[PDB]
Nucleic acid binder design. Structure first.
Ligand code: NA
Ligand code: NA
Length: 326
DNA sequence: CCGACCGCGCATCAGC
DNA sequence: GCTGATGCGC
DNA sequence: GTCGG
């Protein structure tokens, strides 16, 4: 909102480095810079001002100076005037098409969605799904739809086995008004980190979701992770809902509530909580919470039966998901 | 100055 | 056919 | 590209 001109620039630069330069760490630098400036409560007036922010160094400082004087960035103007870079960049918007595949397609003249449709033969299964749902995957999901989608997932999971537990996480669980996909964490009493005593725990749930025609396509599926496509049923009279990306992860039950914690976020809240654990003698990753020895050695994972248990261990007032922005 | 920069499940490829 | 590396999205 | 050891 407040510095959107700069942050659009920094994001554009980020996409370039990831997709064209294949410089993943520059991409994440530019993103880090863009997030920190999006959070800044004043109109940036100089590159020096921004440089005080963590993640803005000397090069982004001068790019801001240029952007403020001229309103554009010549480096970005050249990049956009270059047919190759813009086609590689554009093609990475197809899910399953990354910097490698996008580069290769462009090298042999496949540069547009239409070009991809002509050469569907040359796409893997994931890429074909990405092409089919190209528009729908770039749409947001309003929360009311999210709420409907959750009702379906939780009802259908329960139909396979009442002993399943399923949680939709992400920004949605924090009460976000819109989401980018649906992220479901699944667990069962028979699946602990010490033994698997059920063969097809995730399969049974994806299969039930398919048979009620909620899950429509599969991008990838194994014993513990499903990535696919779903759609809310259309109400006979009205327009169809866009197809939506959904992930479902089967997590061992002794690690489930640490998983919920980590995948609920936010990322800034995770890292402030991971930092406070350390100060009080514990380390938390996405799987466990462990005490630290006097010399920095992690002990065994502590029992966790709810989220608040993790809070109890590190002597933190419980934080409801809606209050975990920072 | 110099290396770290999230780590991992799955699909596919590369090399055998 | 096998095992390990790579691409990819998260 | 930025940071911190
Ligand atoms: Na800085
Ligand atoms: Na892509």
């Amino acid at each position: 909102t407040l510095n959107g001109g700069i942050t659009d620039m920094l994001t554009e630069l980020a996409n370039f480095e990831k997709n064209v330069s294949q410089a993943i760490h520059k991409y994440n630098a530019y993103r880090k810079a863009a997030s920190v400036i999006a959070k800044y409560p004043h109109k940036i007036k100089s590159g020096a001002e921004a440089k005080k922010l963590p993640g803005v160094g000397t090069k982004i400082a001068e790019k801001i100076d240029e952007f403020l004087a001229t309103g554009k960035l010549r480096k970005l103007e050249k990049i956009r005037q270059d047919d190759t870079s813009s086609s590689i960049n554009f093609l990475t918007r197809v899910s399953g098409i990354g910097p490698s595949a996008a580069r290769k397609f462009v090298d042999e003249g496949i540069k547009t969605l239409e070009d991809l449709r002509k050469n569907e033969d040359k796409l893997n299964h994931h890429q074909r799904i990405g092409l089919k749902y190209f528009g729908d995957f770039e749409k947001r999901i309003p929360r009311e739809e999210m709420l409907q989608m959750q009702d379906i997932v939780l009802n259908e999971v329960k139909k396979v086995d009442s002993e399943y537990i399923a949680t939709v996480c992400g920004s949605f669980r924090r009460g976000a008004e819109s989401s980018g996909d649906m992220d479901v964490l699944l667990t069962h009493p028979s699946f602990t980190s010490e033994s698997t005593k059920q063969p097809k725990l995730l399969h049974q749930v994806v299969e039930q979701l398919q048979k009620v025609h909620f899950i429509t396509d599969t991008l990838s599926k194994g014993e513990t992770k499903f990535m696919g496509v779903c759609q809310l049923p259309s109400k006979n009279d009205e327009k169809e809902y866009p197809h939506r990306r959904i992930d479902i992860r089967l997590i061992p039950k002794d690690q489930y509530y640490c998983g919920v914690l980590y995948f609920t976020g936010s990322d800034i809240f995770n890292k402030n909580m991971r930092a406070h654990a350390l100060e009080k003698g514990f380390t938390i990753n996405e799987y466990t919470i462990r005490p630290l020895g006097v010399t920095g050695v992690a002990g065994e994972p502590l029992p966790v039966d709810s989220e608040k248990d993790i809070f109890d261990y590190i002597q933190w007032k419980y934080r409801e998901p809606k209050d975990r922005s920072e």
